[PDB]
Amino acid sequence: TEELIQNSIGFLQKTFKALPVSFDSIRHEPLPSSMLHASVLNFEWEPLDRDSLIDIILKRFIIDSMTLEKGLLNSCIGLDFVYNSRFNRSNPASWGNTFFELFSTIIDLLNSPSTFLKFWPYAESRIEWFKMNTSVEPVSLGESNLISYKQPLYEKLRHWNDILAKLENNDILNTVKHYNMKYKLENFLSELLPINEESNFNRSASISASDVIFAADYNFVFYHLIICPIEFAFSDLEYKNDVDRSLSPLLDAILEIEENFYSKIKMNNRTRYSLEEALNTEYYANYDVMTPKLPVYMKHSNAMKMDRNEFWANLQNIKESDDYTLRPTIMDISLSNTTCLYKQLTQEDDDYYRKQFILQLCFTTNLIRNLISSDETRNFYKSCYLRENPVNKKRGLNLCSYICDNRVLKFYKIKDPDFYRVIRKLMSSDEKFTTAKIDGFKEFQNFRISKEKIPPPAFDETFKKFTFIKMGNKLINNVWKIP
Amino acid sequence: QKQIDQVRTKVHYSEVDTPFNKYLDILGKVTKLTGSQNISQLKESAHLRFLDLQSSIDTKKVADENWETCQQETLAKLENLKDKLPDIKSIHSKLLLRIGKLQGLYDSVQVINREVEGLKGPKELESINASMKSDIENVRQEVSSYKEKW
Amino acid sequence: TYFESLCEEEQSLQESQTHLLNILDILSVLAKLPDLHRELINSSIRLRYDKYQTREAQLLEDTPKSISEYYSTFEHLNRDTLRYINLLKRLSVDLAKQVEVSDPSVTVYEMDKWVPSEKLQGILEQYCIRGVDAQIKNYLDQIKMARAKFGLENKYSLKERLSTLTKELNHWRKEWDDIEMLMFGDDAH
């Protein structure tokens, strides 16, 4: 009996073309109300086990319709039907499977990242439906009824990992829509699962992957120190010196430019303050208030206030529109050019490229000191590497204290605290999570959700009445009781 | 070390692929029973599991196709990059002149500040002189009043 | 290839289904055979064999100068936009802002809303080219003259009058005060 299936498909495709809902009015905000004429929600349709039969019907239907707005819209109505028809189901608790299945297959057809981003807000709005693995009843907000090694996800998770893995390899054939799609997919999966799931938190630390005289050194210290921190910690007293030989002249060559940059502004403020206190009678400059702020004539003029607006609009549409979908990111240093790099670092005006570097140093140099100083950490890492694949201290701590504590902090702490502080706050905030990952994120387990209703409180409005011993105590009052 | 890769190749080819397996089950069961009315029931599960499996393959035939084309378009897009340079160079030119103009402004302000210092009060010397001329009339008036009343 | 291998797999599936149905028919009549038994066996072997090939086939397949001048300028852009943004605010030059407020009916000046010299406003905005610089060159001398006129009027015109005019006022509020105080001060007594 394939006849029955085909004619059921014609039936559904008939009735679904009558519901008056548009794509925008079905995906983003809503979920379609129970306007379905419930006698269809009772599985007693016109052309006639029962469940899986309905399943293969719906699946066959969706596959046909996708081969645009009619397709996507029709499918979305499909899923919403599946949700709205829980109870009229033999073994209702078994509605989860037939749901997830019908979703994944849709993800498959989707012949672009553009159609994907076009379709995704639908999935964004209905996350609460993906939870409730088999619980027919809605779940309390902030709780996930779902486990990563069992029936619903047991293969879905593997597949959706293969999509990302494939999407990451073609490193050069990615347009900004790709990098903007992998984001939404990942961010999606990081929410179905709780915060400590053996899968969300990266359970095992898995570190990612004359100008020529200048670029040579920069390149050197990059590939030898930053990208591999462990291969610098547990090395000989020579490699640890080989890197040392390259680092220092570079670092000096940058902390020479930074002082010029900061030493221009100091002048262009001190002179102005001196003029102000000179001309006026009784005004005081209140030094040490550097606090950049733009001048008055550019704040008040509206003409100048508009040119910048139209300019940013222009560059915005040029950078955003198509034909320009292979853009380098902002702020990305290009190493292999070796002639622009020197120019990107040795500028006196823009500071934003000499800061990323120092951020990188102050990031790894934290971990090194943490390793050599604390046994528990390097114990943990040793355990990780081995489960993957079955005086020196003094020098390391010296070149660790030389940079993040002797030339950097003693520089920015005096030059500009508004950037001096953020470094210390991040370096602090890192150890928190490091120790948190040494443990199995047990802290994020104690999180409790109070579930109880509360009515408005009581507000007394009544004062306190009096008594009949008017004068106060009885004794004094008896006196006025005399005639 | 033979053991390590010996298991690594094992994990490298793991598969789930449920519906296929589901078909193999109903396939072999008939054989096992064959070596020697409810069978109509099996007939039901015969068709169903046959359709599903089939449908699955269809998607894998479609998806692999689509992806392929998406790598060719973005490939050809990377070729004709002659047309795209002139415009971006125009924008880059404009932004190269704005900095120039602004820089000239920050020069003019500089010379103004450097010349005010060479100096007292443009409208101060206005209200002061006005006050100086406004009252001498009054003094002449009152002195004429005392010369009168005498 | 992978696609082709899929096609062949589907072919084999279609090969076996018909034999299956064909046997279940005979069982349906029962409530000859060994042939179909053998057939279904062989076909099933063929399919199951036919998958592994598509698995391995899958897993294998996973692993002209204008371009290089397209990224270069497109990077210069991202390098100058930053210098521009820093050049607006953090590297700015500001004006002197001395106060010359008139209208003596106010005591605090708040030192912020200074909004200089609305004549100067148009000249500065005019930048957004030597003409404007020359117009500054003239503006300065203009102010230096206007300021210099009255700074000498007050010293050489009005001081001279105010001095002598206020020196010959006491001379008839004093002696008149005597001719009015002496007689009428003792006359009553």
Residue numbers in the entry:
A (entry chain A): 4 to 51, 60 to 78, 89 to 230, 251 to 431, 443 to 535
B (entry chain D): 5 to 40, 59 to 141, 197 to 227
C (entry chain B): 8 to 38, 53 to 84, 97 to 161, 167 to 227
Mind quoting what the paper says about this structure?
Here we present a 3.7 Å cryo-EM structure of the yeast THO•Sub2 complex to reveal the molecular details of the THO complex assembly and the THO–Sub2 interactions. For cryo-EM sample preparation, the THO*•Sub2 complex was subjected to cross-linking with glutaraldehyde to obtain a more homogeneous sample. For obtaining the best quality map for model building, the THO*•Sub2 protomer was extracted from the two rigid copies (1A and 2A) within the tetramer and refined to an overall resolution at 3.7 Å. The largest THO subunit, Tho2, contains a ‘head’, a ‘neck’, and an α-solenoid ‘trunk’. The ‘neck’ is embraced by a bi-lobed Hpr1 (lobe A and lobe B). Tho2 ‘trunk’ folds into an alpha solenoid structure, which binds the Tex1 β-propeller at its center and stabilizes a semi-open Sub2 ATPase at its C-terminal end. An extended region at Hpr1 C-terminal region forms a ‘belt’ lining the Tho2 ‘trunk’. Tho2 ‘head’ domain binds to a four helix bundle, formed by two pairs of anti-parallel helices contributed by Mft1 and Thp2, respectively. Overall, THO stabilizes a semi-open conformation of Sub2 by interacting with both RecA domains (Sub2-N and Sub2-C). Sub2-C makes contacts with two pairs of Tho2 helices (residues 625–695).
The evolutionarily conserved TRanscript-EXport (TREX) complex plays central roles during mRNP (messenger ribonucleoprotein) maturation and export from the nucleus to the cytoplasm. In yeast, TREX is composed of the THO sub-complex (Tho2, Hpr1, Tex1, Mft1, and Thp2), the DEAD box ATPase Sub2, and Yra1. The THO complex is an integrated structural and functional unit that regulates the activity of Sub2. Tho2, the largest subunit spanning the entire length of the elongated THO, plays a critical role in THO assembly.
